[PDB]
Amino acid sequence: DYYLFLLRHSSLYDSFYYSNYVNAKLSLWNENGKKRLHKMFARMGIPLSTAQETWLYMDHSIKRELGIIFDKNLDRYGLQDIIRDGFVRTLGYRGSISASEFVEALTALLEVGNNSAQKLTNLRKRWVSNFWLSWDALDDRKVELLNRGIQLAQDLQRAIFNTGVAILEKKLIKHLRIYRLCVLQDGPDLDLYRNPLTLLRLGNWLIECCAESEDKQLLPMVLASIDENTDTYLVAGLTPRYPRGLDTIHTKKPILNNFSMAFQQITAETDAKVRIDNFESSIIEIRREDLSPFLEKLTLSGLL
Amino acid sequence: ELTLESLSNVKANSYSEWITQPNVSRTIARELKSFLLEYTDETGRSVYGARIRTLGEMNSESLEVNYRHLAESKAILALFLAKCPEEMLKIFDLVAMEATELHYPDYARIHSEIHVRISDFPTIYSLRELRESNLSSLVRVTGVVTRRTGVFPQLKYVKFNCLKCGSILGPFFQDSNEEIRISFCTNCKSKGPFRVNGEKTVYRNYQRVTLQEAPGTVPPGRLPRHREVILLADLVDVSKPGEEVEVTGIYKNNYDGNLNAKNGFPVFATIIEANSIKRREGNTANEGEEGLDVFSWTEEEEREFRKISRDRGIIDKIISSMAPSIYGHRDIKTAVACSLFGGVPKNVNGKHSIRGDINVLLLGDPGTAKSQILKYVEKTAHRAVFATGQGASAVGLTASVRKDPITKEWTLEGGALVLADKGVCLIDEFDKMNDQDRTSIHEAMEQQSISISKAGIVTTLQARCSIIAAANPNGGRYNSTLPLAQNVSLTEPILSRFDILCVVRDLVDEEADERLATFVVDSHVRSHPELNARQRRLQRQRKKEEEISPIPQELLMKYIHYARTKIYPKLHQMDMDKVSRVYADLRRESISTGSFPITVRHLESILRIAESFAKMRLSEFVSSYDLDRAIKVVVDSFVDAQKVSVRRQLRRSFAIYTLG
Ligand SMILES: Nc1ncnc2c1ncn2[C@@H]1O[C@H](COP(=O)(O)OP(=O)(O)OP(=O)(O)O)[C@@H](O)[C@H]1O
Ligand SMILES: [Zn+2]
């Protein structure tokens, strides 16, 4: 299999387009990356019309020789790391599913499915409710729910890409000495980032984009998102990651997350209106008024 | 083997036989490949390598080769191509495919053959001056498309089968104008029934068109001449019925029984097989420039666009470069630039469509260079149509219904607004026009569509067009002591559809007159018509452009085309309260004292102008500067159309919004 997003349930062009690794290695958010991808597809010998067809209805001859075409061409563009081995499960005259696609469908089912304290309580209740929707999809009888999860995953990844290009083009990322800050205050569809998993998706997109950047640094990142209804920011701290294909000389116990201790230290000393109640200690909910001072304290907190 | 010196001497008393000899055709191919690989221009960059690189990216099937390049070096091959096109083109296509398979190996799975499109042939003929000496040679002819047959599949490798011997005949290349005639069998040794060998065959796209002579070329008062042109694959549907085109092709002859029967002499029919197509509809810049499309860009040109797009004050230079020889009238130039770049159309949930084009009106005194500005807009725009006054009708700016001469069914034909889809329609002397003809554009100005219900045809067309109109006030001159509604005859329904209105007044001022006269006299002095010389001409023509144009016009045309084609800015973060307050104030100050209709339709024009100013910078997001500039433009367009009594108060009242 390949490090491609939902290959067997979408086109080949879509798989190459919405991939974190390909986007990091080719910078598809601007025009140059799209032109480079078109040049690659032209060189490989696959017509642009054929690469946009559904996987089931794709040409048999092209599908048969995909491995050789990948092996002989992927090295020129630095994408030789997309080839790997995985696990594929098939049940009768139904169709093949890979483990990666299954976990993305499950995550999509988790994310979307189905006076401020009550507002937060209803959101948490819906998040609890989504658990049974994800639970039902593990049974072989309920395949329509798995298909629904696949569609939801496609839509969610499209939204993440759309927000990420806006973040990257306007230079919203601010490089402080200790960490890198990104606060999303205005824009469309900020109601998708009230869920921690969607913000983790966007953070994984940004970290993947930064890891392959020629700039050599390992600073942690802070991602903040506003909810108008609750007037609260949801703030998450994300650890840096080494490049995927880098050697094992640096390999060790991975970089440690130090945001929990810093958040507890700042919360204890000052009477900030923060909520640290999630299982993940790196995700907090801070009132709108306290965001700008609190972060300043974090700048002097250290351990980051 | 032979040498380029040895191709000069000719044998067989015919050039075609000399070219088709096996030893000559091996030197020709090598020389053509060396020309393709090793040619460099003045700057030192190989152009055909870049063209081949772009070909695979775009999944193109054709290559464009300039005749001047192949004539400057290897002139013998240029002469051979000029005299004998058919045999040279077969070899040149093969060498082109071989050169293409050096950048994109395995490209044969996309396209199996590469076609070559010749450009900039030196000699241009008219249809009236074609004679028999031009038979079987490459020619360049201008004309006007009249009628188009439509696309049908045509056989490429024709096969035959004979039953009594069961023989299958080898593939035959069809002439595309003469039916393949076979009567002898290699095996049957006698006449036998021949089948078409059903299935297992290769087809091509075929189309036919008729070119009349252009009215400008035809001598005044004489009948035009027409000819037939065959368009093969990759060239179908490029030309449209009504456009004016230039075709490079091969002039051929064929035997027709009816022509011999009627005339009474053994005369032959002629037809042109098209090789290259260039559009000339609205183009007056055909005097210079090289290529098949002067609105297309290369990679280095796109890089230069992105380089000059990040300079501060690009909008100011773009505005200053509009109609450079006209002095003053900067608001008109700003409106023209905003209309040229345009806005962004929108569709909300697939049920609510919002227009994204800016319309401009110019109402002014005589002798203020409005028509010259319209002509400049016609020249710069990619697609432009021109009309004036009583010379246009209700169905001449719209779709008309005609009986097809062949099919004999009622059919729809195009018009001025349809010929300028995604373009500009210019209407000079817009007030000296019938009301029935003027009211035909009401649907196209806002809904951007045309609906016809005539003679059993019930259809809706699409006209995404922008209108820049010029008019004269009542009495020929503007009374500044009167409101707008009494200086024009147009009513509210047509005045609301315009985005920007420019009132041009001529006033007595000694210093202004002196400056205008000095500028005009200097312009007349400049325009007086009295290494390689053909590049000395270019450098001298650039020196004159240096003074009054911050950027060259040829660069600006491609800049505008690229900006319109690629960029689509959005409005994520912006100040809603300022726009709401401005709209409410404008609505209040209209009924109280004013005669300029303001509705919800004028709220969206500010956003459209903001998106246009964002496009000017090649940015994907609208900032605060662009929105503020749009608000300032809209406010200045409203204040200066008032009476002299209340203008000073209105300007002061509206001055808080435009602080910058
Ligand atoms: N700054 C200028 N203002 C006005 N006219 C100018 C200027 N510079 C040059 N001219 C010349 O003045 C002449 C008058 O222009 P033009 O014929 O367009 O006037 P008009 O009254 O707007 O025309 P029309 O009635 O055809 O719309 C033209 O020859 C034009 O080139
Ligand atoms: Zn036979």
Swiss-Prot record, chain A:
Domain of life according to the entry: Eukaryota
Role this protein plays: Required for initiation of chromosomal DNA replication. Acts at the origin of replication. Also has a role in minichromosome maintenance.
Annotated protein name in UniProt: Cell division control protein 45
Similarity-based family: Belongs to the CDC45 family.
Subcellular location: Nucleus
Span covered, complete protein: 323 to 650 of 650
Miscellaneous remark of the record: Present with 1730 molecules/cell in log phase SD medium.
Gene expressing this chain: CDC45
Subunit structure: Assembles into a complex with MCM5/CDC46. Interacts with MCM10.
